[PDB]
Structure formats: structure tokens, C-alpha cells
């Protein structure tokens, strides 16, 4: 029997985590009046078996929700309320993306207390997570720095005007793309990872990836999805059942570099 209040769903295996969807049934609606950000889509489970944490995903420079949508149903199907946003302007900088990301999390908490919302009472507004691609990745790390109460972060090919994230205390997973030319691994992703000192962290380089190696439609949704859901489950939920999936080398040929620190089983 489970003793962790935040644990949801059954014992996972690599198979169930590598699938395209988890145990729960996902529905999705469109925020009719976004507050603090451009637009948004809310993915959520109908049968999580209790309230779940909320995750907000921000796309990159020039990009929109379609570049990151594949995360919403994948995460929500495993017991999360996921909001994929568009920014006020696709040119918004990483700092602005942090504000809009956090605003998207606040709106999800507002909607949680709205009787007409489909996520009415389905979100534990005290457990929030941040994700993003490229400049949205940089904005997610900024969100973690400014908001240490967030429970987890996971970013793809992160870009920011600075690589100094030594103050981040939130557990942060970084997907890096080997052949990234817009945010080269050895100049952004990896220097960002090594900078962090006060958190559990993981750096996972996808072999032969371009800047969008983790975007919607990539050929590694089994691994990147397994590791993203595992990380969020492990740290947003205290789900030690996901400890090995989150903390250990997946020994996958799709990975060209793996590093992790302070990831406790």
C-alpha cells in the first residue's frame, strides 16, 4: 500500500513510461482569457486519483505551442496538469518568458478554484513545475531561480544570455542536443548544468540532435518522455518509485552523454 500522499498511478516500468500515453485519460481545453501571457492550452487527467501538480511549458524564440505540445498529453496522462502557452510576442526574451510562465501557473491555480473549469479541484496549487525549449528553457531556469518553491524543472536545448544558474535550488533536468548549432551543448546546455550546485540535476545529451531534437515530432519520444515524466514524478510528487528512472543512466544508444548529481534514490 502507498503511504505517500502525492503518489498517483501504479508502479511504472520502462515500457509503460516509454509508451505514448500513461494510465490516465487526458482531456484538453483552451484558456479563453489568458492573464499575463499570450495564449494557452490546458491538458489534464480525468482520473488521476487525487489532485496533481501543475506544469507550464514555454516554447522558444519565434515558436508556438505546436513546438512543445507533445509534452502536454504525455505528462498529463501520467498525472499532471500541463499548460502549454504562447507568449505575448513570439520574440519575447527569456526573462519575459519566466514571468509569463509563472503567470500561466498562477492562472492554473485560479482555474483550480473555478467551479466551471474542467480542472476545478484537480490541481495541488502548492506543487508547480516549469519546462521550456530554447529561450523558454532559459526562462524556465530563471523561474526556478526566482521561485525556489517550485518542485521541478525540465528544459530542452536551453538558451539564455547568461549561463550562470548557480543559485538554482529546484531539481533541474536538462535535455541537450548533440549537434545543436543555435544553443551549442558545450556553450549553453553543459555550462548551465555544471553551474548548478544546490540542487539535484541531470544532463542528458540526445545523440545527433539539432536545436529541436526534443520538440514535437522528434524520434526519441520514448526516452525523452520517459525521462521527463520520471523526473517530474520523482520530484513534484516524492514518488520514490520513479527514483531509478529519474536518477540513473538509462543506458540508451540514443544518449551520447549522461551526467547526474545529488539524485537520491
Amino acid at each position: 500500500m502507498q503511504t505517500n500522499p502525492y503518489a498517483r498511478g501504479p508502479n511504472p516500468t520502462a515500457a509503460s513510461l516509454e509508451a505514448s500515453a500513461g494510465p490516465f485519460t487526458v482531456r484538453s481545453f483552451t484558456v479563453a482569457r489568458p492573464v499575463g501571457y499570450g495564449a494557452g492550452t490546458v491538458y489534464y487527467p480525468t482520473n488521476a486519483g487525487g489532485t496533481v501538480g501543475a506544469i507550464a511549458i514555454v516554447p522558444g524564440y519565434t515558436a508556438t505551442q505546436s513546438s512543445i505540445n507533445w509534452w502536454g498529453p504525455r505528462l498529463a496522462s501520467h498525472g499532471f496538469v500541463v499548460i502549454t502557452i504562447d507568449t505575448n510576442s513570439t520574440l519575447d526574451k527569456p526573462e519575459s518568458r519566466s514571468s509569463q510562465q509563472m503567470a500561466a501557473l498562477r492562472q492554473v491555480a485560479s482555474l483550480n478554484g473555478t467551479s466551471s473549469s474542467p480542472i476545478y479541484g484537480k490541481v495541488d496549487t502548492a506543487r508547480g513545475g516549469v519546462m521550456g525549449w530554447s529561450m523558454g528553457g532559459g526562462g524556465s531556469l530563471i523561474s526556478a531561480a526566482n521561485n525556489p518553491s517550485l518542485k521541478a524543472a525540465a528544459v530542452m536545448a536551453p538558451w539564455h544570455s547568461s549561463t550562470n544558474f548557480s543559485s538554482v535550488t529546484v531539481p533541474t533536468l536538462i535535455f541537450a542536443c548533440e549537434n545543436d548549432r543555435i544553443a551549442p551543448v558545450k556553450e549553453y546546455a553543459l555550462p548551465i548544468y555544471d553551474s548548478m550546485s544546490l540542487n539535484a540535476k541531470q544532463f542528458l545529451e540526445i545523440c545527433g540532435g539539432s536545436h529541436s531534437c526534443a520538440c514535437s515530432g522528434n524520434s526519441n519520444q520514448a526516452l525523452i518522455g520517459m525521462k521527463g515524466v520520471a523526473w517530474m514524478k520523482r520530484f513534484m510528487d516524492n514518488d520514490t518509485r520513479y527514483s531509478q528512472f529519474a536518477c540513473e543512466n538509462p543506458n540508451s544508444t540514443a544518449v551520447c552523454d549522461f551526467r547526474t548529481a545529488n539524485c537520491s534514490l
Side-chain angles (χ1 to χ4, degrees):
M1 192 151 91
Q2 193 54 243
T3 71
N4 176 13
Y6 308 122
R8 308 280 177 269
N11 272 275
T13 45
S16 50
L17 270 167
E18 276 166 18
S20 301
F24 309 140
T25 298
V26 184
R27 304 273 155 253
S28 54
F29 70 92
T30 301
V31 181
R33 190 141 189 274
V35 168
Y37 57 105
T41 296
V42 168
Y43 307 81
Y44 65 92
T46 57
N47 48 343
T51 45
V52 298
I55 310 172
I57 318 176
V58 182
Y61 192 63
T62 80
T64 58
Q65 290 179 58
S66 60
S67 68
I68 55 171
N69 277 174
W70 84 274
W71 275 112
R74 174 59 156 279
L75 273 162
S77 74
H78 280 276
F80 294 103
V81 172
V82 188
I83 177 161
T84 60
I85 74 153
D86 287 311
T87 51
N88 287 322
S89 159
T90 60
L91 311 190
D92 286 328
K93 64 201 286 195
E95 281 90 346
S96 170
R97 283 158 196 284
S98 188
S99 296
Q100 302 181 58
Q101 187 176 43
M102 296 303 294
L105 276 177
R106 280 192 309 266
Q107 179 141 22
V108 162
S110 161
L111 285 164
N112 182 59
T114 288
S115 43
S116 61
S117 173
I119 60 158
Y120 178 56
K122 288 175 152 110
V123 161
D124 182 341
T125 60
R127 306 190 278 128
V130 286
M131 295 177 79
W133 170 52
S134 182
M135 273 195 204
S140 292
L141 303 153
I142 286 164
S143 284
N146 300 330
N147 301 268
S149 47
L150 289 161
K151 296 305 200 257
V155 293
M156 297 147 293
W159 188 95
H160 183 42
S161 44
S162 175
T163 49
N164 165 37
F165 287 98
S166 283
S167 76
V168 177
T169 62
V170 180
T172 296
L173 166 63
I174 289 159
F175 294 96
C177 303
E178 189 184 8
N179 297 111
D180 194 324
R181 300 191 184 156
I182 300 153
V185 172
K186 313 295 152 183
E187 295 170 31
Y188 289 93
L190 164 58
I192 284 164
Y193 168 84
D194 292 320
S195 71
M196 298 183 292
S197 315
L198 290 183
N199 60 355
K201 52 187 196 161
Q202 188 158 107
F203 169 90
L204 196 155
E205 182 187 73
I206 305 305
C207 288
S210 63
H211 193 44
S212 54
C213 82
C215 290
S216 292
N218 75 93
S219 59
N220 297 283
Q221 284 179 46
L223 180 83
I224 295 155
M226 173 270 261
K227 271 273 165 190
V229 161
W231 192 262
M232 284 292 144
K233 291 285 250 200
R234 172 56 181 88
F235 290 108
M236 285 198 75
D237 294 4
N238 279 103
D239 214 328
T240 44
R241 301 175 301 167
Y242 293 76
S243 283
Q244 301 219 78
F245 297 115
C247 290
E248 277 177 341
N249 207 322
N251 291 121
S252 160
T253 199
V255 177
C256 277
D257 198 353
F258 176 85
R259 332 189 181 199
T260 194
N262 314 334
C263 205
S264 161
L265 306 173

